[PDB]
Design a protein around this ligand. Structure first.
Ligand SMILES: NC(=O)c1ccc[n+]([C@@H]2O[C@H](COP(=O)([O-])OP(=O)(O)OC[C@H]3O[C@@H](n4cnc5c(N)ncnc54)[C@H](OP(=O)(O)O)[C@@H]3O)[C@@H](O)[C@H]2O)c1
Ligand SMILES: Nc1nc(N)c2nc(CN(CO)c3ccc(C(=O)N[C@@H](CCC(=O)O)C(=O)O)cc3)cnc2n1
Length: 186
């Protein structure tokens, strides 16, 4: 398997969710960015794996589950069975990552993408080693009930550019946003 990555879109007040959905109106090109970044594998013959908590799984409309072109893994401590459509169910993040080191999965999985929610991001971001954060800065406050922790810049470096990421400010529906990539190596 390849690198470990988080991807997230965050409002100005660090919100990521509200009532089991996103806090802002649908941003078509921001979803297309999430889709492109999580689907595109750098190695031929492999797919990427997305890891998410249970509420994040059910925040994806059923018609889009599992996320196409990606191996979908759901984290849950209490589910008796994998949610219909999921490819894998793991009881902890460590269990999920050790799944990716199985030989027959490692030769089919390139990047691992953490796609939320709050507790999954937090655990991944404190795991030592190489990690990238793909962060969309939604440049407006939105009412939220689920949040992302402020990034420690002594640990995470904001990259000046990244292949395949547009650096210019974007705007949809009167909402400005910009794509950022952070990297730590501790
Ligand atoms: N803006 C963004 O980029 C973004 C990204 C993701 C999500 N969201 C939004 O955020 C909200 C969902 O996130 P959330 O933080 O509320 O919930 P979440 O982390 O997706 O789901 C929490 C549940 O997942 C399971 N879980 C989480 N961490 C686990 C671990 N380490 N091991 C085993 N199981 C684990 C537990 O399920 P059990 O109770 O079954 O044990 C837990 O109750 C929604 O509003 C969604 O739309 C936004
Ligand atoms: N930067 C960024 N932005 C976010 N919004 C985000 N959201 C999440 C979690 N949630 C909602 O909380 C999603 C809900 C739905 C989809 C979804 O349906 N995806 C399809 C459709 C693509 C299309 O519309 O064509 C696909 O990826 O194929 C994806 C994530 C995680 N990480 C994100 N990171």
């Amino acid at each position: 398997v390849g690198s470990l990555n988080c991807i997230v879109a965050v409002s100005q007040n660090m919100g990521i969710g509200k009532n089991g959905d996103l806090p802002w109106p649908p941003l078509r090109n921001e979803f297309r960015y999430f889709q492109r970044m999580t689907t595109t594998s750098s190695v031929e013959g492999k797919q990427n794996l997305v890891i998410m908590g249970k509420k994040t799984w059910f925040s994806i409309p059923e018609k889009n589950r599992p996320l196409k072109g990606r191996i979908n893994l759901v984290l849950s401590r209490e589910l008796k069975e994998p949610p219909q459509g999921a490819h894998f169910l793991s009881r902890s993040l460590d269990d999920a990552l050790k799944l990716t080191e199985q030989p027959e999965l490692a030769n089919k999985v390139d990047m691992v993408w953490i796609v939320g929610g709050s507790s999954v991001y937090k655990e991944a971001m404190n795991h030592p080693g190489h990690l990238k954060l793909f962060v969309t800065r939604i440049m407006q406050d939105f009412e939220s009930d689920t949040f992302f922790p402020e990034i420690d810049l002594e640990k995470y470096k904001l990259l000046p550019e990244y292949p395949g990421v547009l650096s210019d400010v974007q705007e949809e529906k009167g909402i400005k946003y910009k794509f950022e990539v952070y990297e730590k190596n501790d």
